[model samples]
Structure formats: C-alpha cells, structure tokens
Target: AAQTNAPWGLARISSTSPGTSTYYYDESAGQGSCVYVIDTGIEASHPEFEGRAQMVKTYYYSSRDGNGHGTHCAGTVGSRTYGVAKKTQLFGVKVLDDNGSGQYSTIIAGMDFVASDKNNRNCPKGVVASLSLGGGYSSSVNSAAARLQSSGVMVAVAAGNNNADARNYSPASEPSVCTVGASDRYDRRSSFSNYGSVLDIFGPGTSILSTWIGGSTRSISGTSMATPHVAGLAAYLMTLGKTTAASACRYIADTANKGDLSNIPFGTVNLLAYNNYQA
Candidate 1:
C-alpha cells in the first residue's frame, strides 16, 4: 500500500510533510490484529468495512448503531479506506447508548467481555480496544480499564472535548490506557481538546472524514475522533510484535512525533501519533 490514495488523517499519520497526498503504510497493514470499538455501536453493514466489521457484543439498548459515533470510530480504526490499520478486525463492543451515555457498571461489563474474548480466542497478533467516550473520574471505570490492561489488551481513550485538564477525567486519567488528544491538519491542537499531562499523544481530529451509519460518510471533530487513530496505530504496532500494553505504549512514546504541535498547553505532552510509513 505504498502509493495508496487516502484521506487526510491517513495521509497525515504517515507523512511529516504538511503538503502530502497519498497515505503510505507498511505491507503488514495490520492484517492479523483485532480492535474492540467500545462506543455507541457500529453499523457493520457499512460497505467500506467489506464484511470485516461486526457487533461482537453490546451493553446498550440495541446492537445496531442508532448513533453514528461508534461506526465513525470503527471506520477510522480499520475501514478499508479511512483506517489506520486497514486489514485489522473491527469488533464492536457497544457500551454507550444512542445518546452516547452509559453507566460505569455496564462499561465495566463490556471490559469483562473483551478480556474473556482474548482469553478464549486465538488472536496471535493481539487484541486492542478503542474507547472514544469519557466523563468525570470514576474509580469503578478506572478499575475496569485496569483489568483490560492487566490482561494485555492495549486500550486507547479520548482526552475529552472539554477545554480543561484531562487529568480530571476517568478513562483518560487512568494510567493504564493510552490517553489521546486532538490536533488539526496544521499541527495545532484542537481548541476543544482536553489537555494536561494525562495525554499520551495527539492525532488528527478536526474535520475527520469517516464512515457513518447507512453506508454514508461524515466529517466530525473531537478528541473522540483522535483517540481511534491512536488505537488503530496501536493495533498496527501489535501486528509488528509489540506484545503487551507497556511495550506498545513505550514504543509509541519513543516513536511519536515530538514538539511538532503549536499552542500546546504547558503540562501536556507535545507528542503526536505517527505510523512511520514512507513511500
């Protein structure tokens, strides 16, 4: 996929040039990995998925995605066109309702399912999770996220859309998961992106064009969009043999694009997510 055409987000991850057109990626292309999109839900029937995406489980009202949030996130994680890891498995673990809200208990149960799937499956490459939702601090939620981390499932979560300290949020504040913030095409931090030292990295989030419900597409902006970029990268990294969460996070930190962002707050890390694909 060296000379492949791609969206702006895909283009941005593989290139350092501000003026890039193609999205270059390694041949592995996350062919043997898995990602659990724990969000509203995913419309697996979206044609871009090419029958690879599915609703593995749900804690919400329905398995179908009434809201487009989870489907959009899943698209960014592993869609054939917009994904960071095109060939990776996209498993929907619906934790949020149509309103994008859920109780911590159910969210914890969703984590339990992920752990069970990893333990009772044959994912040699590994399983990663993408969490694009969050709220104020919750010890219960943190513990669940911790359990997933302990089980060797790497999770990437949103730093939230609130323009305040991300350290005050739940899953983002949870040290075990990779907390991702939002940046735009110009290497500037998104104005609504949460900040502070909790952020592990930033990704292109503004005007992110991705798959929506009913096989259509939409462009939305938020740290929610940015988190999946990191998750998809983490999935691709796992295919390259980054075995565990610690190893993956360390590699991400060591390889992240540093000090390339503008208007970064004082306490937040200046790193941006990159996949190192050159063509």
Candidate 2:
C-alpha cells in the first residue's frame, strides 16, 4: 500500500532545503526503535501503519480508538508518511476514554505496563512513550514517568493546550519527561500553546494532518499534536547511536532549531523541535 502524503509537521522536520524549501521523506528512517502511544488507543488496522502498530494494553477501555487522538498521535510517531520515524514500531496503551478524559491512576497503570519487564506484548528492547494528554498536577504520574525514564524508556509529554504555563500540568511539569509545546508552520510559538521554562522543545502542531479512525486522515491542532513529533524524533535519535534514554532526550532538545519565543521567561533560549537527524 502507498503511504499517505506527508503532513506539514513531518514535512517541516524532513525538509532538506530549509531556505530553498523541499519535503523529503526518508524511506530508511527509524527501523530499530518503538514508541508507545499512551493515550486513548490506536486503530491498529490503520492502513498508514502498514501493520507496524499494535494495541498492547488497555487501562480504562478497549484498545480501539474512539476519540481518534491516539491514532493521530501514533500516526505522527510512526506512520509511513506522516511520521518522523517512518519505520518505528507503534504500540497503543489506552488510558483515556471515548470522551478524551482519563484518570491519573489509569495513566499511571499504562506507564507502569509499558515500563515493566513483564510486558511481553511490548517490544523487548523497550519503547519510548508518547503522551498527548494532561491535566492538573499529580505526584503519582510524575513519579511513574520518572521511574520509567530512569529505566531507559524515553517519555515525551504534551505541555497541555490550556495556553498557560506548562508547570501547572502533571507529566508536563515533571522534570523527568520531555515536555513538548506547540509551534506553528512559521516556527513561532503557537498561539494556543503553553510555554515556560518547563517545556523542553516545541514542534509543529497547528493544522497537523495525520491518520484518524476508520482508516481516514484529518487535521487537528494542539500541544497534543506536537508531543509525538518529539517522541518519534527521540526514537529516531536512538537508532542513530544516541541509544541511552537520557542522551536521546538531550539530543532532541539540544539539537532543536533555536528561536526567540514570546512570553517565555527570560527568553534567552528556546528550542523548536527539528528532526534533521544529522547527528
């Protein structure tokens, strides 16, 4: 099956000629890594996945995606065309319900499952976890993600869509995980994106097109949409010899396209997620 057209987010990251402008999808990208979409769930049979995505576990509901957020995030992480890591494995760990809400306990359970050595359904080599959801702060959620990160699982979390400081949200405020904010097509901080010193990087999230439920595609906007780009990039960096979880996380944020984002504290430095993969 042919891969769908590259979305703006993927195209921006995979662009070879930044000044001249061209979109180049790497066919040989990210083969030995995996990303766990720890959200609503994923449509495992989505055509864009090419049988590489799996529904490994469900915390609060079935592994089938009813809200479409999880599948969209999954597509951005590993779908053939709309992804940063085109060939990376995608695993679904459903924590949210059909209404796009989940409890912290459920979220913790999903994280624990993915980080557990007993999880045979997941990749034995472990996986990076992408979470495109957030709410009020939770010490338990922070602890779980910290534990997972300590054990070599790279976790990327949304900085939230609330248009406030990211430090107010759990997992996003958690120092251990990579918190991602939204950037527009022009590489400016998105109008609806949360910002602060807490955010590790920003990625193209406005009007992002990716795989949706029922084998379709759609465009959506949020920091939720930006988190997966970093998650996929983290996995891709791992394949390029930045194998350690902490090293991959550092590479993703450190190699980002520098910018002067408005309203951010100090404004001395900000990193916009860019997937050049040169290093």
Candidate 3:
C-alpha cells in the first residue's frame, strides 16, 4: 500500500541538509550498519530518501501530529541531504499524530518494536537506535531503554529544548539517556536551546536548512532538529568502525567547540565540535 502523510500530512519540501558539512563515509568499505529511527515515519517515497533508509519497521499509533514536531525530526535524521549515507536504514515509529502530540504508551510501543523481531531484521548487524522523542522520565522507560542498551542498541534523545532546568523533563533528564541541546553554525547556543545539569550534549538545530512537509525547504530550529544531527553523526561514525553508543557519543562530541554560550540570550552550542572528533 502506498504510504500516506498522515498525522503530520507533511509534504516533501526541498531536500533537508545537515547543519554541518562534516561527513565521513566509506562507500568502498560499506560497514553495512543501520539506524533505528524512532519517530514519525519518513516520507518513504521521497526521492531524497532513495536507498538511504533501510526501513525495517513502522508504527503509527495515532493519526495526529500531537505537536507537528516529529515529521521535521524524521527528516533531520534520515532525509537524504546534499550528501547521503545511501545505505542507512530506518525504523520510523509514528507514535505522535499531526497535532504533534502523543501518549506515553505509544512511545513505549515504539521502543518495544525496536527491541522486538518484527523489524529488527531490516537493520544491519550493529545498528544504533536514534530516538529524538521523549515525554517525561519513567523508571520503566529507563529500564526498557537500558535493556536495549545492554543488547547494543544505542538510544539518543532531545533534551526537551526548554530553557528550564533539565530536571523537569523525563527521559532527557534520565541518567541513562544521552540528553541533547541545540546550537547554531556560529557556536552560540540557539536562543531556544535548552540547558541544565542534565544536558549531556548539544547539536546543530538553529537556522538549520531542512526539508519541510511540503515540496519545499526551510531553516527550522528546535532541539528536535539538533537531535538527529547527533543521530546521523553517530550512524556515520559507525561506518568508520566506531561502535557502542558511548564511543559514538565520544567521537561526535569529543572536541566540541566550548564557546561561552551560557550567558548569551537563549544562546547556541558550538556545532563545529561535532566535526572534530579526532582531537
């Protein structure tokens, strides 16, 4: 059956591009890895997505967008940009509806599938699960994700994007989760980037040029946008033989630009740090 742009009803706008131009791919080597995209389903038919997503699983719990947030996020992580993994696969779980809102149970169901068999087959041998969506924290959520982690599935999430203390959020604040914030190309924490003690890292989110629902493109900004940069970077590193969430995390932000963004208004984090994992 042909896929419908339900919930978000997102149109395939201009192809979305990564915030940073830094990418490392070994086409000749082909590490044969995959990324489990746990979010609104991707535009399966979009040309930019051609051969880039493995598409192992999909779950649309609601026919609404909840907050119209997931589509943009889906694009950030898996959408084929100026550069393409070409072989990267995705397991998009549509837990949220077009309203950009969804239920906790729905979110869990998405995770549950990742750990299950129905879709794991489509993924490569050493796959990393990229999760940009999180409601609040829960012992069960942590436990479930932890179990996946122990099994070698890496989970990354957006740190709520709220400027408030991270403690107020759930999974983003959880010790087991890799919390992310947003920054712009210049290294300033985006005016909207969230921060706190729980914030583990930051990614490119502000003024990010990406695909919109429609057949056009725009520079949307949000922590959600920042989440996928980390996801893609993590997946990209896997090609270079960097496995494990912790190691991938280290490789992506090992030398992130440490700019004085805390005092600036809203502020953005230094995205260049993502490019320099060697130092």
Candidate number with greatest TM-score? 1
Flag regions of model 3 displaced more than 4 Å: 1-31, 54-69, 82-86, 117-119, 122-125, 259-273, 277-279
Candidates 2 and 3 compared by lDDT, better number: 2
lDDT string, candidate 1, 74-164, tens digits: 9999998888998898889888998888888888899889988866655678888998989899988888888888888888889999988
How does candidate 2 score on lDDT?
Answer: 0.79
| Index of the highest-lDDT prediction | 1
- RMSD (Cα, Å) for all candidates, in order, is 1.4, 2.9, 7.3
User: In candidate 1, which residue pairs clash?
Assistant: none
Worst 10 residues of 3 by lDDT: 6-15
The best-first sequence of candidates by lDDT reads 1, 2, 3
**Candidate 2 structure quality by residue, lDDT tens digits, 1-279:** 123355667766654323323445344566777788988899999999999998888866377899899999999998876878888888898999988988888888888888883245434333688989998888888888888788778888999888888788888899878889887776667888888778888887899889999899999999999999988887776775655576676777676666634444564237776666442
Backbone clashes counted, model 1: 0
True-structure RMSD for candidate 2: 2.9
Q: How far in Å is the alpha carbon of 105 misplaced in model 2?
A: 0.7
What lDDT would each prediction earn against the true structure? Answer: 0.86, 0.79, 0.55
- Minimal lDDT window, size 10, model 1: 241-250
Deviation from native of the Cα of residue 166 in model 2, angstroms: 1.1
